[PDB]
Ligand binder design. Structure first.
Ligand SMILES: [Mg+2]
Ligand SMILES: [Mg+2]
Ligand SMILES: [Mg+2]
Ligand SMILES: [Mg+2]
Lengths: 232, 231, 237, 233
């Protein structure tokens, strides 16, 4: 199995290599991440061979001057053929409403659009930074569970800092209330603070709920945004 | 009813005012458009009162230097309570896979997340300049259709340059074939062109097929991205 | 001596931690790196969060700043005050000749100088490659010892070639350019223009660009005044 | 004389067209303004014909930096003799000059071997009235064109000028000023408000505008500090 690993934090993010190293336990890993969300069709993108980090296995890698999705398109070209696309591990959550505009998820989705299996890995940190050393057992367990699915799949994974269980979840979909608070730059002029907040607690079985409980969340994603119940 | 109109092309787009003018036939309109996709929580957002053009109906408006989503949040605050959120008319399409990365759609979606009914409007350019005088009738008809839906609703609308009909559609979801075209700049340095293409043509009943046939496309959207099928 | 280290490549750049470690051989080092303009953000408030230094680097108190490199200096002098030196880099990419004008790496250093402190910017020309900070360390230390001998305050722009073979105080390469615009079209027929301006001559001896090309570490003392002092009382026709 | 006019506020800035109209009194004017920062080489640049606001000037809207506009303009309207940038809405005095897009365009023009000048008007409170400034803009341009060439000058015009002065760049020291605070979400942030240590020196651009005079500062391309050059050991 040939695996392509990317992310949206950059070729220097420790989560990227944590995912690459973890993924190497299942197949040949190839890395291609941005050097710093759709495929760039506008202008040409640059890409340079990059050396895998000193304290980590050897990984054929490329630094891409483009979007995470660009890395997938370019990766399938430079490392083709690829069977799996893994994106992350993102430094920050990608839960509920956040999924829609996630760059990490976009890369995986792009992999799916190309007929491959893919998964996005994120870690809600809401304060500190993740410790990928004590998180590896869980990454491996998660990957092992995902690789048992029928191909092709598209899964969104969120691993709480100190995971204590795995669980399949559905996306949290809560309503929000608009909260705006007026202020002024100490130079006179006015501005506004935006602090939208959910109206209720995450429902049971949702990705939000699951991580709050301290479990790893794995949500199968759909590509069709159509609301069928409304079609006629 | 009170209606908030926004977009992502900016406060100076003829598309924004065409939507605002059309929406004004159905209720009072307030405008909040970006100065030039999530709500800004990191830092505060600036907004300035924006004047109405001499040769046009006056709309209370604000130029918000933030995201389209920010415009919705702030608009709900400066003009609240708002009953409906309209976004567009965008100068460019928002069909199929494009819906994901759309600022136009995001604003409408943000309105929906706040418990309101919303819709996004876009028009494929295809080398021509949209004629909003000719599109007005179709905007009015589309709104008439939308305003009778059970609320709340969230719809993505795409109007062809010269419409000949209206059609409820589902999002075009096609697989792609990667295509990488290598090249090099005048300085010898190599680079890559991306030109991925759909493995097949748009299916009948999809937004892409619809506008291709010359029909206004209206796709009802869902917020839930989970594939309940694989649980 | 207390030293503030920043850069413009962000908190995860290996060039940043290489400069922090090298700098630590001369005093207490504190890090404040941008997260992701060049001026200090005054319009609105800036976010800054404590950041744990990387696992494979000595410990350093650090902050990830949601602002510009200059902001990191402004924030740094406040969180770690008092600071004696502001070091910026080691940037992944050169900052030679005309490049100095638009450099974020240089801007943070300049910001330190604007506050009355001594400062230096460090960069490494890449040419589609990455530096070996283990091999450059000797040269980084060498350069730092030198800079610290200078009468303070100072502002120096440093460029280290991948594999240094010496050190040289240099002046800024200032060359005239010829406009070169090559029309083109993308894989959709849409037209665009390639800009490929080229210098009218080769970098002259004694310039930063020439020295690095020769494999020498380049150190250029910079001025803050952009005034052309020879034309303040111009003869008009 | 063929003149390229650009700026960094964009193709819709009233300052740009006020500068274009003023320059037209001295030669043929062509415009290339950014579509709202050195020359873009990493990839190509898109540019499109754009109509001048309702005098007519050939114009292009460039999706690039102000420097790209100068490089593109030399190609589109070559041969060019003079590059003028502005009139920027906001000052470009003292330390600001270093990171100014407006000045960058002019510098780019000078690097291509042409004469160039940047123009800006300090704001906040009152909006510039270019009809009132036209006399001073023409006076200034007229003066610059009597200079030996090539030249590179940064110009700052006060809302209502009463004189003209050649000036040197204000170079002052700053003292850091940070004010910790909190958002409505509890999270902390910091305000930055660094203030200059002393008052603007007599004869500096900043002093001149404060006196109500047009400020014209000749600029140098070489940032090297010769008083600190050293021999090899
Ligand atoms: Mg990220
Ligand atoms: Mg748009
Ligand atoms: Mg950099
Ligand atoms: Mg400006």
């Amino acid at each position: 199995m040939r695996i392509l690993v990317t992310n949206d934090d950059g070729i220097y993010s420790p989560g990227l290599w944590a995912l690459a190293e973890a993924a190497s336990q299942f197949g040949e890993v190839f890395v291609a991440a941005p050097d710093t969300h759709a495929i760039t069709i506008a202008h040409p993108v640059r890409a340079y061979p990059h050396p895998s980090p000193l304290h980590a296995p050897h990984f054929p890698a490329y630094r891409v001057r483009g979007t995470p999705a660009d890395c997938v398109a370019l990766g399938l070209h430079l490392f083709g053929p690829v069977d799996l696309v893994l994106s992350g591990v993102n430094l920050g959550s990608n839960l509920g409403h956040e999924i829609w505009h996630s760059g990490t998820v976009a890369a995986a989705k792009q992999g799916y659009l190309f007929g491959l299996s893919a998964a996005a890995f994120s870690v809600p940190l809401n304060g500190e930074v993740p410790d990928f050393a004590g998180l590896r057992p869980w990454l491996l367990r998660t990957l092992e569970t995902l690789l048992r699915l029928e191909r092709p799949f598209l899964v969104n994974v969120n691993l709480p800092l100190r995971p204590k269980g795995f669980l399949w979840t559905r996306q949290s979909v809560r309503a929000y209330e608009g909260v705006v608070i007026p202020g002024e730059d100490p130079m006179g002029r006015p501005f506004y603070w935006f602090a939208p907040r959910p109206l209720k607690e995450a429902e049971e079985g949702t990705d939000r709920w699951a991580v709050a409980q301290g479990f790893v969340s794995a949500t199968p994603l759909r590509l069709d945004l159509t609301d069928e119940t409304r079609l006629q």
